[PDB]
Amino acid sequence: NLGQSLHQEGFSIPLLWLQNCLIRAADDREEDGCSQAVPLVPLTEENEEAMENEQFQQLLRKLGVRPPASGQETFWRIPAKLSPTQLRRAAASL
């Protein structure tokens, strides 16, 4: 339950968004030949705040999410190399 400290700090809504991103990516990757990196696009002020939070970023790295390429990208990415199983395990871990 890696998410627990962030839940207690009030980040349940951004954590739910992160969870859905991981699960949706897993579903897409169950098809052979289909594996695209997914940008984590914060679409609300609350999710923006989470993406700029150091503790939330630490969780992202632990789950295997990669930071943006500086000078090229704005968004963190769910790397293409992660399998549906790896992704679902990350989501299940919070």
Added chain:
Amino acid sequence: ENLGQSLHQEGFSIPLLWLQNCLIRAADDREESQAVPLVPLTEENEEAMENEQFQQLLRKLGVRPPASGQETFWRIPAKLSPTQLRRAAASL
């Protein structure tokens, strides 16, 4: 307009047109106000938003960088009037 044309020649025409439309939509919204983010949803618009020359243009048009540690996105400030926004868009 000169800075924009230079970015057009460096291959940023598509993000410039996106930026143009964002400014115009903000202008329309403010006639009918709050600061609104510039949200790049494509790799190409992301690349522009992270480019130093493109950022120099944003600053000249009156767009402000994100608040460090709080925001991800650049903002179109509330202080820009619809008239200012349309003039900015018209320069590209």
